[PDB]
Amino acid sequence: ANWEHLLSLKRQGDTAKRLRIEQDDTRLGFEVDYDAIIFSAPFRSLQDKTQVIPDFVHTRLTHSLEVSVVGRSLGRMVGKKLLEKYPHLEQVYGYKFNDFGAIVAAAALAHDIGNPPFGHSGEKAIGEFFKNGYGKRYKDSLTAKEYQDLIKFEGNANGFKVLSQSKPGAQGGLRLSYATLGAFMKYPKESLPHKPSDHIADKKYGFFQSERALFEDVAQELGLLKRDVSWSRHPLAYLVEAADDICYTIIDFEDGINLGLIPEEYALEYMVKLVGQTIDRNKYNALQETSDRVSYLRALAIGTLINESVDTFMKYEEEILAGTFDQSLIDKSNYQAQITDIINLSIERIYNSREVIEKEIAGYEILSTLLEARCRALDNNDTHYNQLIQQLLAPSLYENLIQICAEVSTMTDGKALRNYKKIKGL
Amino acid sequence: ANWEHLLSLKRQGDTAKRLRIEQDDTRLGFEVDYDAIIFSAPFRSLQDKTQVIPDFVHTRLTHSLEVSVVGRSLGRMVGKKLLEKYPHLEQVYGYKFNDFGAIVAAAALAHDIGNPPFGHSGEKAIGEFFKNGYGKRYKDSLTAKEYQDLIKFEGNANGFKVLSQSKPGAQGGLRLSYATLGAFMKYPKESLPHKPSDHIADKKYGFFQSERALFEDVAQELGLLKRSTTDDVSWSRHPLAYLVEAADDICYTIIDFEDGINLGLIPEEYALEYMVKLVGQTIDRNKYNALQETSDRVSYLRALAIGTLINESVDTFMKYEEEILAGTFDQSLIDKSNYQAQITDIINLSIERIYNSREVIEKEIAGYEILSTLLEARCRALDNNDTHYNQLIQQLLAPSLYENLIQICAEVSTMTDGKALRNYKKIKGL
Amino acid sequence: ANWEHLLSLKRQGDTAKRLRIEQDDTRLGFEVDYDAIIFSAPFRSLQDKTQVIPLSKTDFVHTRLTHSLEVSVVGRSLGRMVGKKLLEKYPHLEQVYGYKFNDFGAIVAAAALAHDIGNPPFGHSGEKAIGEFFKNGYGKRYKDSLTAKEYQDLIKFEGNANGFKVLSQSKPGAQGGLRLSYATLGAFMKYPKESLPHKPSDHIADKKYGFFQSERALFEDVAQELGLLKRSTTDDVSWSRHPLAYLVEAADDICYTIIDFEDGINLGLIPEEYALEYMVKLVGQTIDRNKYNALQETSDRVSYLRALAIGTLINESVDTFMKYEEEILAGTFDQSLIDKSNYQAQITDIINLSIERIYNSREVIEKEIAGYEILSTLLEARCRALDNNDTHYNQLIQQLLAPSLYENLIQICAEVSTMTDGKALRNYKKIKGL
Ligand SMILES: [Mn+2]
Ligand SMILES: [Mn+2]
Ligand SMILES: [Mn+2]
C-alpha cells in the first residue's frame, strides 16, 4: 500500500484527479469533510440519541465530539512522524501533518453516525426482528448475504450508508474524501463469511450489500490490499478505533462515578498507573469536588493513552501498511490490565445497572414495533390502516428492507418513543 | 307516494292510527321525537365523540345540534311551500309547516347517533376486524348479508338500531314517529347488493339484518316506493331524507372549513377566496372589514354561506319535488347546486389540510388499535364464556351468533372516545 | 394423634430432639418463629401487595401485610384461649412436658402471620393467570417432559403451596429457609396433600393442595415428626390437618369476612345504610347503641361494629374447636370452624354482599384483567428466556428478572408470585415499551 494513494482527496463521481499540491489550504478537502458532517441531519440527530444511559450523561454527539478531538491529536502526531519517515509525502506531494489529523477527526466524528436509538441493544433488536420476529418471512426471498446484513444489522455499515447514500439532487451523500471513508471503515468486509478470523477487523462487517459497489470503488482508489470481498484496513482506521476505545473506556468510567454507580475510590485505584508519572499531587489534593478530581484523572489517563497509541502505531507501521497487524492499537497497550478492570467494572455497574437493562428491554419492543408496522405496510400497501401507517412513518425487497432499517435508525430516542406510542395509542 | 302517509305519526307497536288532527299541538308527536332524543343516553354520549379532530373542535353533539338547526329551517321553508302546493294536507289532515321542520330537525338531531368513536377510521376498523382480523372465522357461520353487515359496518345502520332497540320494559327504543324514522333513512336498503348504482341512496346501507323487519314496517306505513327488482329489499328515500342530507352536507362542508381556519390548519386567505361566490350578494363589506378577529370574520362568512345554501336547497327540492316523490331523483340536493365547484374546492382543501394532518392521522391510527383490541376481547369471550378471564371481560365490557356479533359492534360504537381508550388501557393493563 | 408430638419444636436439619421443658422461655422456639417472619424479606414484600382492592393514595386500603397482621392478632387470641382449655383438659401437657397456654397462641400467631406470604399479586386472577399459562398458554409445551403431579402443580398453581416453598426454600448459605418449628409449619398447612388427586372429597382440606412436588420430602418429614394421621395409602400422600390449622383458618375467615366489609363501607363500595342490617345479629347483644349513635364518623361506627363482631366470632370459634376437639384430633372433622357457626347465614350474607359490591366492582375487575396480562407477559418472557438462554434479549430478561426442568418452572412461578404489585407492573411496562 502507498501512502500517496491512501490519502486520496477523491469524492464520489469525480471525473478528474484531485492533487494535494493543488488544493486551496483554506478549503482543504479533508477539513471540509468535518464541516459537512457537523451540518448534516444525521449528525444533528445524535443530539437526542443515547450512548449507554438514558442529570448529565454523554449522548452520542458529545461522545462523537470527544472521539473526534482525541482522533485529531492521534492524527496530528502520527502525521508528523509519518512525514519524517517518508519525506517525499510532503516534499513531492505536498501533504502536511494536519491533513492526517483532519482525516482521523472527520472519520471519528462520523464513526457512530449510523447507530440506532438505544445503542447496541438497538442493533440487536433490529437483527432479532429479522432472525425470529416478523421479519423472518423474507428469509427465502433474500440472498444469504442480504439476510445476514439484516439479522446482524450493523451500525457501522449503516453509517457507511448514511454518509454515501445517493438521492435525487444529492448523489454521493455527504461526498466525503475517499481517505476519510477509508479511515471510517474499521471492518472492510461484507456480512459473510461470519468472523472468518479472530482479528478485530473480521469481528463485524462494514458495508451492506447495497453499498458493496461503492466501497469497492473506495478500496480501489485507496489501493487497499485485498484480504466474498474483504480488504486490509486503511492504516488511519486504527487511530479512529483507538480514539473511540480511549474515550468510551475512560469516559464511561467517569460518568459512572458521577452518577453514583461506581464508588469514587475505584478511580484512583484503577487509574494510578495511567496518571502516576504526570499527575500533580498538590493539584489533586486541593480539588474539593469528586467531579473535578475524576475529570483531572481522565484528562491525564487520556493523554497517557494517546501518547502510547501513537508509539504503538509507529512501531507497527509497516505491519499495518502490509495488512499483517493482528490486533487493535489498544490491545497492545501496557495498561491492558487496568483498561480491563475499568471496562469490567463499567459493565458490572453501568451496563448491567437496572435502568440500563430496563431501557434496553423497552427499546427492543419499541424498535420491533416500528419495524413491524413498516414491513406490514410494505407487504400490503392496500388496507386503510397501512395507508395511514405510511403517511405517519414514510411519506427491490432487499432495498426496501435495508431502507426501512436505515430510517428506523435515524430516529432519535425520543422520536422513536412518540411514534411507537401513537401506533399503540398511548 | 302520498304525503299523507309519508307524514305518519305512528310509533312502534301502535294498534290504532294516529290522526294529525287529533294531536295535542302542545305535545305534537314530531316535536316529542326531538325532546326524546335530547334526553336520551345515546345522544349525551355524542359530547365525547369526535366529528373530525380529537382547543375547541366540533364534537358529534355540537355538529348534530347545528345540523338539526339548519334542518329545521329547511323543513320549515319546504313545509310552507308544500302546503301551498298540496293545500289538502293542512285543510283536511291538519298538518302545519312546523311539522315539516320538526321531522327534519329530529331526524337531523339523530343522524349521526350510531357513529363509532374515532370517526370514519372507527367504522373502517370495525369492518376490517371481520374482513382482515380475528372476525373472519364467523364467515362460514353467517349469511352473505349478515357478514356484509359486519365487514361494512355502517354507523348509519347502527343509528337505526340505537333509535329502535327493544329491551325488556322498553320495546321500540325511543319509539320515534315513523315519519321521523323515514327522514333518518338516507340509504333505505340492506347491506347487499353492494353499491348497485351510482345513486347516493345506494352508496351504503341503512339497516342491519336484525332491524330489517322494523324498517319493513316503517316503509309500509309510509308508503315508500319499492325500488329493488330482486329478493334484496330497497326502497326510494322519504322526501324529507333529502333535507336531512342537505343540512348535514351544508354543515360539515362549511363548518369543518371554519374549524380548520380557526385551528391554523387552513390559512385565513382561503376563507374569502373560496366563499366569495357563496356570500357576495349578501355580505356587508364594511361589517366584515370592521371585524378584528379572524374567528368573527369567518363565522360571519359561514353564516352567510349557510344562508345561501339553505335558500338554494329549498329551491332545488321544490324544483325536483315530483321526481323525489316518485323515486326518480338521481342525486343529492347539494349535487345540483350552482356552487358545486366552490363546495368541492372547500371539501378538497379540508381533506388535504385537516383529515390528512399529522395530528388527525396519529389519532386515527391510535383509534384503530383501540377499537381493534376491544372487538377481539369481546369476541374471544363470546366463543369461550367459561374461562375466568372471559368472565371478567364480560363483567367489564358487557354487564344467536349474528345477533351477538351485531350487538358487540353496537356496544363498541356506543363507547365515547375516552371510554374506548380507558377500556383498551386496562385490557392491556395500564 | 398426640398433642406432645403435634407441638414439635423441631427445625429442619435437627439432629437431636428439642424438649419443651428445656427451652429458654425468653427464646421460645415458637415465638422466635414469629420474629423471623417479621424480619424476613417475603413478609416485608407484603407491604406493597394488594389484598383485595388495588392500593391508592387517596384512601387507606388493606395490604397483604396489614391483613396478615390482623389475622395473626386474631389467631394469637384464638390460640391463647384454646391453649388454656387444652391445658386444662390434658394437664399432663403442662405438668410433665412444660407447655404453657401462650405456646399455642405463638404457634397460631406465627402460622397466621405467614399464611398469605406466598400468594401471587393481583389476587386469585394471579393464580389462574399462572395456571392457565401452563394449561393452554406457552407453558403447555412442557406437559410431556413433566409428571402428572409436576404439571398439576403448574396448571393449578396455588399460593398456599408457594407459601410453604417460600418459608422453607434452601439457597446457598441459607438451608431450610426461615427454619420455622414443625408445629408452626403444621398449623400453616391447611391442605396437607399434593396436587393430585384433585378434590378427592368435599372436605375443605381437600379443596386445594398445600405443597409442591419440590417440597414433598420436607412435608413428609414434617408430618412424620408431628404424627399427623394418614389420609392416603397410595403414592399420592395426604394427611389430616394439624388441629391448630383450624384456628389459623378461622382467624383468616373472621378477618376477611368482617374487614372486607369494613373496607367496603369506608371506601364507599357498600352503602353505610347496610352496616347495621348485616351486623345486627353478630353484634346485637354487645353493641352500645347510644355509643354507636354518638360516634360522628362512619369509619368509627364501622370499626366499632367490626371489633364487636370479631369478638363474637372469636369466642364462638374457641367453643366450636373445643366441642369438636376429639373429632379434630382424630382427623374426622369434615368442615371449618366457621361453617359450624350459629351466624353462618349472616356470614354468608356479608360475604355475598362483598362479592357483589367489592369483588365485582369495576376497579377490582379492572385490576384482575390487568393482572392476567401482566403475569402472563412475565411468565412468557421468563419461559422463553429459559428455553433459549443464548439470545441477547433473553440475557437481558435474565438480568432484569432473575440474576431440572420442573425445578426451573416451579422457581419461575415462585419468583413471579413474590413480586409486589408495583415491581410486576414496572417490569411488565418495560417489556412492553412504557
Ligand atoms: Mn463510539
Ligand atoms: Mn353528520
Ligand atoms: Mn388471608
Tab-separated table of N, CA, C and O in Angstrom, chain B residues 57-112:
chain	number	residue	atom	x	y	z
B	57	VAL	N	-63.002	22.042	19.249
B	57	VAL	CA	-63.277	21.404	17.937
B	57	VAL	C	-64.714	20.907	18.058
B	57	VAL	O	-65.135	20.572	19.169
B	58	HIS	N	-65.425	20.884	16.947
B	58	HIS	CA	-66.829	20.438	16.978
B	58	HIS	C	-66.862	18.981	17.402
B	58	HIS	O	-66.074	18.202	16.880
B	59	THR	N	-67.740	18.645	18.330
B	59	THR	CA	-67.922	17.238	18.723
B	59	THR	C	-69.075	16.689	17.896
B	59	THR	O	-69.670	17.459	17.152
B	60	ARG	N	-69.343	15.400	18.006
B	60	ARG	CA	-70.512	14.868	17.329
B	60	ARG	C	-71.786	15.530	17.834
B	60	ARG	O	-72.719	15.725	17.053
B	61	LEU	N	-71.840	15.911	19.120
B	61	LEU	CA	-73.047	16.549	19.652
B	61	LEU	C	-73.230	17.955	19.095
B	61	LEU	O	-74.341	18.343	18.713
B	62	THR	N	-72.167	18.751	19.081
B	62	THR	CA	-72.294	20.113	18.582
B	62	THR	C	-72.577	20.136	17.084
B	62	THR	O	-73.369	20.953	16.607
B	63	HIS	N	-71.929	19.252	16.330
B	63	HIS	CA	-72.264	19.088	14.922
B	63	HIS	C	-73.740	18.744	14.737
B	63	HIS	O	-74.410	19.309	13.866
B	64	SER	N	-74.259	17.815	15.547
B	64	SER	CA	-75.630	17.340	15.364
B	64	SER	C	-76.650	18.425	15.682
B	64	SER	O	-77.685	18.531	15.013
B	65	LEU	N	-76.366	19.265	16.666
B	65	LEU	CA	-77.283	20.374	17.006
B	65	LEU	C	-77.332	21.341	15.835
B	65	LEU	O	-78.410	21.849	15.554
B	66	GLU	N	-76.182	21.612	15.229
B	66	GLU	CA	-76.098	22.543	14.079
B	66	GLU	C	-76.832	21.978	12.864
B	66	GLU	O	-77.475	22.739	12.170
B	67	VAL	N	-76.703	20.683	12.631
B	67	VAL	CA	-77.439	20.050	11.514
B	67	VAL	C	-78.929	20.181	11.814
B	67	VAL	O	-79.668	20.547	10.915
B	68	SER	N	-79.326	19.954	13.058
B	68	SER	CA	-80.760	19.989	13.331
B	68	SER	C	-81.324	21.401	13.258
B	68	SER	O	-82.518	21.573	12.978
B	69	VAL	N	-80.497	22.417	13.500
B	69	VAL	CA	-80.957	23.796	13.352
B	69	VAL	C	-81.120	24.144	11.876
B	69	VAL	O	-82.149	24.687	11.453
B	70	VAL	N	-80.107	23.831	11.069
B	70	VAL	CA	-80.196	24.044	9.636
B	70	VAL	C	-81.328	23.205	9.050
B	70	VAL	O	-82.023	23.642	8.124
B	71	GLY	N	-81.556	22.009	9.601
B	71	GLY	CA	-82.593	21.140	9.068
B	71	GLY	C	-83.994	21.634	9.384
B	71	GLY	O	-84.891	21.537	8.545
B	72	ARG	N	-84.199	22.159	10.602
B	72	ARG	CA	-85.479	22.759	10.963
B	72	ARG	C	-85.828	23.914	10.044
B	72	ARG	O	-86.986	24.073	9.643
B	73	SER	N	-84.841	24.742	9.717
B	73	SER	CA	-85.066	25.842	8.790
B	73	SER	C	-85.458	25.334	7.399
B	73	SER	O	-86.420	25.824	6.788
B	74	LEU	N	-84.733	24.338	6.888
B	74	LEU	CA	-85.094	23.713	5.618
B	74	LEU	C	-86.500	23.120	5.661
B	74	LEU	O	-87.301	23.338	4.747
B	75	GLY	N	-86.799	22.320	6.692
B	75	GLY	CA	-88.106	21.693	6.782
B	75	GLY	C	-89.228	22.709	6.889
B	75	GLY	O	-90.281	22.547	6.278
B	76	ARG	N	-89.005	23.778	7.655
B	76	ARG	CA	-89.986	24.853	7.774
B	76	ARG	C	-90.219	25.537	6.438
B	76	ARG	O	-91.364	25.802	6.051
B	77	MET	N	-89.138	25.885	5.742
B	77	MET	CA	-89.301	26.583	4.473
B	77	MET	C	-89.973	25.682	3.447
B	77	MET	O	-90.929	26.096	2.776
B	78	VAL	N	-89.502	24.434	3.335
B	78	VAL	CA	-90.107	23.481	2.405
B	78	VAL	C	-91.551	23.192	2.803
B	78	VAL	O	-92.449	23.145	1.955
B	79	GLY	N	-91.797	23.013	4.104
B	79	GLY	CA	-93.142	22.721	4.565
B	79	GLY	C	-94.143	23.785	4.163
B	79	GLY	O	-95.262	23.472	3.746
B	80	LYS	N	-93.752	25.057	4.261
B	80	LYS	CA	-94.648	26.128	3.839
B	80	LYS	C	-95.000	25.995	2.360
B	80	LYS	O	-96.163	26.175	1.973
B	81	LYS	N	-94.013	25.653	1.520
B	81	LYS	CA	-94.244	25.589	0.082
B	81	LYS	C	-94.986	24.321	-0.304
B	81	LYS	O	-95.750	24.322	-1.280
B	82	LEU	N	-94.783	23.242	0.459
B	82	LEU	CA	-95.520	22.009	0.221
B	82	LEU	C	-96.996	22.194	0.540
B	82	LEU	O	-97.864	21.689	-0.184
B	83	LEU	N	-97.301	22.945	1.604
B	83	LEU	CA	-98.690	23.137	1.999
B	83	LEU	C	-99.419	24.073	1.037
B	83	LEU	O	-100.639	23.953	0.861
B	84	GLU	N	-98.697	24.986	0.383
B	84	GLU	CA	-99.326	25.783	-0.667
B	84	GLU	C	-99.607	24.932	-1.899
B	84	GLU	O	-100.651	25.083	-2.540
B	85	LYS	N	-98.681	24.029	-2.236
B	85	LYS	CA	-98.839	23.167	-3.403
B	85	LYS	C	-99.894	22.094	-3.162
B	85	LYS	O	-100.644	21.730	-4.075
B	86	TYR	N	-99.945	21.555	-1.943
B	86	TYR	CA	-100.878	20.496	-1.575
B	86	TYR	C	-101.727	20.993	-0.413
B	86	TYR	O	-101.595	20.505	0.715
B	87	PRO	N	-102.623	21.954	-0.660
B	87	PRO	CA	-103.389	22.534	0.450
B	87	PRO	C	-104.258	21.535	1.187
B	87	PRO	O	-104.604	21.797	2.343
B	88	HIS	N	-104.597	20.387	0.587
B	88	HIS	CA	-105.377	19.402	1.328
B	88	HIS	C	-104.634	18.863	2.549
B	88	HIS	O	-105.278	18.409	3.500
B	89	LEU	N	-103.305	18.915	2.569
B	89	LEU	CA	-102.592	18.380	3.726
B	89	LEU	C	-102.902	19.176	4.988
B	89	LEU	O	-102.994	18.606	6.081
B	90	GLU	N	-103.121	20.472	4.857
B	90	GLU	CA	-103.495	21.295	6.033
B	90	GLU	C	-105.011	21.311	6.226
B	90	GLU	O	-105.456	21.029	7.336
B	91	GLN	N	-105.772	21.616	5.178
B	91	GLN	CA	-107.249	21.779	5.299
B	91	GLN	C	-107.938	20.485	5.733
B	91	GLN	O	-108.854	20.558	6.546
B	92	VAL	N	-107.501	19.349	5.212
B	92	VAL	CA	-108.182	18.063	5.513
B	92	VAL	C	-107.476	17.315	6.641
B	92	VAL	O	-108.174	16.781	7.507
B	93	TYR	N	-106.143	17.292	6.650
B	93	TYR	CA	-105.461	16.439	7.609
B	93	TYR	C	-104.870	17.211	8.782
B	93	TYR	O	-104.526	16.593	9.794
B	94	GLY	N	-104.775	18.532	8.682
B	94	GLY	CA	-104.358	19.348	9.796
B	94	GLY	C	-102.867	19.523	9.966
B	94	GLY	O	-102.441	20.018	11.019
B	95	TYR	N	-102.065	19.140	8.977
B	95	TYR	CA	-100.630	19.355	9.049
B	95	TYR	C	-100.314	20.845	8.935
B	95	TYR	O	-101.110	21.638	8.415
B	96	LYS	N	-99.133	21.218	9.440
B	96	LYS	CA	-98.682	22.603	9.506
B	96	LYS	C	-97.197	22.665	9.182
B	96	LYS	O	-96.460	21.692	9.371
B	97	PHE	N	-96.725	23.814	8.712
B	97	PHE	CA	-95.320	23.954	8.251
B	97	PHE	C	-94.303	23.526	9.309
B	97	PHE	O	-93.302	22.920	8.942
B	98	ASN	N	-94.571	23.823	10.573
B	98	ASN	CA	-93.645	23.488	11.678
B	98	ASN	C	-93.501	21.978	11.781
B	98	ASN	O	-92.477	21.529	12.271
B	99	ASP	N	-94.529	21.242	11.389
B	99	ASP	CA	-94.449	19.764	11.396
B	99	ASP	C	-93.297	19.311	10.491
B	99	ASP	O	-92.591	18.385	10.871
B	100	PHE	N	-93.142	19.948	9.334
B	100	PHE	CA	-92.055	19.538	8.458
B	100	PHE	C	-90.705	19.890	9.059
B	100	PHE	O	-89.737	19.137	8.907
B	101	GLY	N	-90.617	21.033	9.741
B	101	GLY	CA	-89.377	21.378	10.416
B	101	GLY	C	-89.061	20.418	11.545
B	101	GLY	O	-87.906	20.030	11.739
B	102	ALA	N	-90.087	19.994	12.282
B	102	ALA	CA	-89.862	19.142	13.443
B	102	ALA	C	-89.371	17.765	13.022
B	102	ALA	O	-88.477	17.196	13.658
B	103	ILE	N	-89.933	17.221	11.938
B	103	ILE	CA	-89.492	15.919	11.438
B	103	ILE	C	-88.034	15.978	11.003
B	103	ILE	O	-87.244	15.067	11.285
B	104	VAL	N	-87.672	17.019	10.252
B	104	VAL	CA	-86.309	17.099	9.746
B	104	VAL	C	-85.348	17.392	10.889
B	104	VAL	O	-84.253	16.824	10.950
B	105	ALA	N	-85.770	18.235	11.840
B	105	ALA	CA	-84.920	18.582	12.976
B	105	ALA	C	-84.630	17.362	13.838
B	105	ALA	O	-83.479	17.133	14.230
B	106	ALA	N	-85.658	16.552	14.125
B	106	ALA	CA	-85.462	15.380	14.979
B	106	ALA	C	-84.580	14.342	14.295
B	106	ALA	O	-83.620	13.831	14.889
B	107	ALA	N	-84.877	14.035	13.029
B	107	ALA	CA	-84.024	13.130	12.265
B	107	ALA	C	-82.598	13.676	12.129
B	107	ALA	O	-81.625	12.925	12.238
B	108	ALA	N	-82.449	14.978	11.891
B	108	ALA	CA	-81.106	15.554	11.826
B	108	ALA	C	-80.399	15.478	13.174
B	108	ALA	O	-79.191	15.223	13.233
B	109	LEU	N	-81.122	15.735	14.268
B	109	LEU	CA	-80.513	15.615	15.586
B	109	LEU	C	-79.887	14.238	15.788
B	109	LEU	O	-78.835	14.116	16.425
B	110	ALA	N	-80.482	13.200	15.209
B	110	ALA	CA	-80.059	11.830	15.468
B	110	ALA	C	-79.228	11.219	14.344
B	110	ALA	O	-78.815	10.069	14.473
B	111	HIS	N	-78.957	11.961	13.266
B	111	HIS	CA	-78.453	11.340	12.034
B	111	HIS	C	-77.105	10.659	12.247
B	111	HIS	O	-76.782	9.699	11.543
B	112	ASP	N	-76.327	11.097	13.230
B	112	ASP	CA	-75.002	10.542	13.491
B	112	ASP	C	-74.922	9.826	14.841
B	112	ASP	O	-73.826	9.580	15.339
